[PDB]
């Protein structure tokens, strides 16, 4: 093929400046009550024989 400039010159649509994140989750801050205080769908208290 012969070469024709015009037709080979294309413009470019590119976004600009990302920052890709993996793992995710991590951003989650989470603690836990003290075991002696649990509950199931029940809501009364899992493990309740003092």
């Amino acid at each position: 093929q012969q070469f024709d400039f015009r037709a080979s010159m294309h413009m470019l649509t590119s976004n600009l400046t990302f920052t890709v994140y993996s793992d995710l989750l991590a951003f989650v801050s989470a603690d836990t009550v003290e075991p002696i205080n649990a509950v199931a769908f029940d809501n009364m208290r899992i493990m309740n024989e003092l």
């Binding site: 603690d31 836990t32 009550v33 205080n37």
Partner: protein
Amino acid sequence: QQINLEELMRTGDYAQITNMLLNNQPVALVGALPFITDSSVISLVAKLDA
């Protein structure tokens, strides 16, 4: 309004308090508590208590 502290540190705090504090809304707290005495009026005008 009110919020039992005993049940708070038990339940695990649902940012309920966290929100009210953030947003500034008239509120109360309840239970055992450490008082702290001050003098030099100053302190007050400066509104330290907040």
